RNA sequence: AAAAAAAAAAAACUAGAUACUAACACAUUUAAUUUUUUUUUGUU
């Protein structure tokens, strides 16, 4: 007791620490559980742990921490009794319905692990009494749970269970949820339903004919999910169910006719061209009859059938313009549509899919009246449709008149906008990019509007004003007005001192698009005055300002190195080297990219001293990014400049400077692909000391050098240095820790292609069997990787003689 | 922990794709069978090493040597030759 | 579990077989592989619990030294290490390509070598370099000061060679005043040993040019 | 933490150390050369010295060291300080011990160049040693001068033929 | 992936369709996460394409993908190119713990 | 007078001290599409 009650205390203290505890506390207690999970009784682990998850006081944060523990224990113990299976399904099962897909996925990993742990037989015995439940919620849950189990264990093993529930005459809800299981199985497997669809079809067909309507509807939705997930192939099976859908459509009306038209509508694109024409023309009558249906469901289905039928070749586009289209636009573009999003998406996408058959000028023609409507959120939807339609079809169809009215409505609806959205930018941009040469007579007022909007007091309208310039700059070059480029660039450079960062970044982006396009010498400010006004901006903190500023400065580094004096460039370097403490990634990547531009601009040796001075800092981001910077400098200005300086720097006694030296060398090797050959020979005595050194970090990082060196230096004909390097590596095979061992293994694999498969194998065959169960476990891994890289390449190299193995091969000893 | 548990999984996958991969304990027979299959596949695959085996064995046709090599991959093929 | 004496009898090179090789699952096969032609044995730091490196050997290792070719480039004086650069790009580019084209490390390693913990290459290279320069018949000035043997004076063992004869392993060794003229003794040398194209000769050597 | 002391690197080829063990290797980390331990910070070092294993290694080094390692005569008159500097040290620490003489063979010298003669070395705690070359194989080497009285002092030489005027600080030897 | 162990790839027979990367993961080898020197386009199996999941990035499988994903030159030299479909399935512990850490 | 032919530390437990690795991840994320769940019950 008192000895084992101490264990009962340890599990409680641990679980407490994970749920409510410090970060470094729970982080270690997780390790303690994962390593000690086998020695604690799963009766005690789950018996203690599960009661926590039932109460309502737990937050999502504290809940996921317990969930993670459940997953880590289940994946280990490997065998579990059925009561705990039922409990874990009671806790984990509700997660599949949760509001956000993260909780869905993490609750899904539980059941997909338990399905393997608990095995096939147990879970099915747990579900059988559950499907019969009178509750709606539980049945809803374990439909999804049952599907997750189905994908996890394969569907065929669980199929006769579904057949039993579906075909069961005993209970009705068993039929219902037994049919829903086919829904979520169809969803999870995706296209992979396919081969199983016949077996699944054993359920649906007869289960469709139940006297109760809510089953008849569920089967209709299953036919839709299977029909869409299948795609064209599945036709041959659905022919058996194709007949009753028609005797169901022509009668039941109401909410059922919606479901059956969803089914048949989803069946259309997989039908042969002969039948497609028939079944479409049959469906279109009911569609037109049902236009006035107030029900959201039925409208949603109508948009589906119109959505699919346009792809059918039988119906002609003239047939659509004469009849279906005008009845479409007037009914489904009513401003009451624009208020609810889920139906907005469907109407817009339906119009877009109709744009293929219909004329582009016809679709856009019907879409100009909604653009000129007064309602703002309605004009927004009217924008979305034009955006996606123009993206697909292009502007080549448009006559000058529609081309004028469209852009007019886009200017108007552009200037009154409220919410922040790119749909105008892209869309109003997608227009410009398409018709750009034809844009010229319209370009003068547009820019003027921008020049007004920049002076507006609201920050959003200033964002949206600056953003639209960056899209126009390329088409403004195509329209040849350079004076407008200069006038813009001047006005932006004057507005460049704005307070609000979110607008200022966009301003600098427009500056970027202007500078890349226009002739460098003709820029008014000019660049030489531009840059010293940029250098204080790098300290603006935030992010977007930093990102856009850095990319722009890099653009200057490419195009205009000679203007700013080298001392100013050094100010830039000292600001960036400080700036890359930023938490964001692209900030650091862009910064490191700019060091190549500056090192090319001014010189390598003035930058390198500054970088190497920064490797003495404790933080890891700084050291690693300065390593990448040294790599890029070595690439752009050549390795012969950087290599002696770095090899000198490696002599320092400090650890972090040495590791940084090795890493910077890794990057500078992977950046120059072929070169790499002249430079080895010098660095093998540098790797000599790295692979020898006591701590496990040098031996790790140096092997990474050996990977990038041996891969692209192979076949060059050195090969006497790689034998040396290998002779230094092989003893490291026994080393533990994940990071060193993966880098060492990668190193041996790279050296396999420098030495060759046989010359590399001569080391391994020895301990490839061996008594020691460990040396064996270590070498079979390298033999695995070598076998994956080489199968017929190792064939001459096996250590096999006629008396070494029983059969051998009699034909290897033949000589002619 | 989780890393090793991925190592086992990729082990099971690559052992399926590439057939023979030694894990830790593999019997000498289990490994020598893989060696035999690789060697025979090289002998048959390259038309060079197939010409060499065909002329050396003096068989009447190339296809006889190739099918001889394929058949040799089954264990019972030795005994089958002995019953002739 | 066949005894290793029974096991060593199967092997053409029985001296490799070890007491633990007896205990393998497949000793007959393992003894055939391990003594097969070119197979190099497993590194020997298994069965040791020291994590393959214990500082006892590692405490006294030298931090690093640049190759003499790179040390010639003068960076050692420019950047101070233990305890603005103004370098010529033509110079550095000539060091790696033109000057150091054929330069290779002094030692490297052979095929069969494997680096065990207590091994140190810095001594072995000094031993090769030792055997190269140090020769019979010659003595350095420092060792002559240690022996108090001025130049032009025969070493003290010359008499025991007069009685007993010349060195056995040095038949061609010529010593002043015995088998070799006494006047030719000068400075540090009192004795001296006095006993193609390989089809691919490149006949032209041209490095890739920078300009 | 370090008490401002400079801990030299292992390779610097030896200012006396406090503890002549803890170093910094070619890398950054701190080492104890006896126990062969790597320490991250000086506090961990102070815990090593205050640890039990380091004591065991110090003792084992202690044992390891403790197991291995009618005629003519001359007369000399050596004079010493006149209460000039000996006024600061009077704590009966061998103060009662008189100067000592020994005959040393030149076969061993700090330079080891020439040799082959003896020296009559004379030593006193503070002052520096003094030597006198004795080419003659034997002089004044008497035969039972006194009547065999056994207070060896240091050796037969010292009692036999030395006088220490401690009141005047004059050491006579003959 | 390379840096994150809990991730599980697909590794099925690559289909005829090219994977896609989000703007954030843009320009990265799906295997070793190397930004430099691309070589070939990735190809994903049927069961990794199907519907909306096809549009997601093949690394983070959250954001929508835009550019085609490339194997770096080294992963083509090692042959890790042709292993199979290099699509990550689960999201990993890091992303989830971020999501619930923030809120 | 002599020579000494080259190997020792632990492990375990429990807590505490401190370096460090992995271009690890860090503000974007939302216009086709599945948590959208009810005893069917919206009429030329
Ligand atoms: Zn110590
Ligand atoms: Zn896939
Ligand atoms: Zn991504
Ligand atoms: Zn790659």
Short mmCIF file of C-alpha atoms and ligand atoms in Angstrom, two decimals, chain D residues 21-22 32-37 39 48-49 53-55 57-58, ligand 1:
data_model
loop_
_atom_site.label_atom_id
_atom_site.label_comp_id
_atom_site.label_asym_id
_atom_site.label_seq_id
_atom_site.Cartn_x
_atom_site.Cartn_y
_atom_site.Cartn_z
CA UNK D 21 43.35 21.70 -11.85
CA UNK D 22 40.34 23.46 -13.38
CA UNK D 32 38.83 19.23 -13.96
CA UNK D 33 41.91 17.37 -15.12
CA UNK D 34 41.95 14.92 -12.21
CA UNK D 35 38.33 13.80 -12.34
CA UNK D 36 38.10 14.40 -16.12
CA UNK D 37 34.86 16.31 -15.65
CA UNK D 39 31.55 21.81 -16.11
CA UNK D 48 32.90 19.84 -8.03
CA UNK D 49 35.64 21.01 -5.67
CA UNK D 53 34.64 12.46 -5.97
CA UNK D 54 37.20 15.24 -6.39
CA UNK D 55 38.39 14.60 -2.84
CA UNK D 57 40.88 11.79 -6.71
CA UNK D 58 43.01 14.23 -4.70
ZN1 LIG G 1 38.10 17.10 -9.95
#
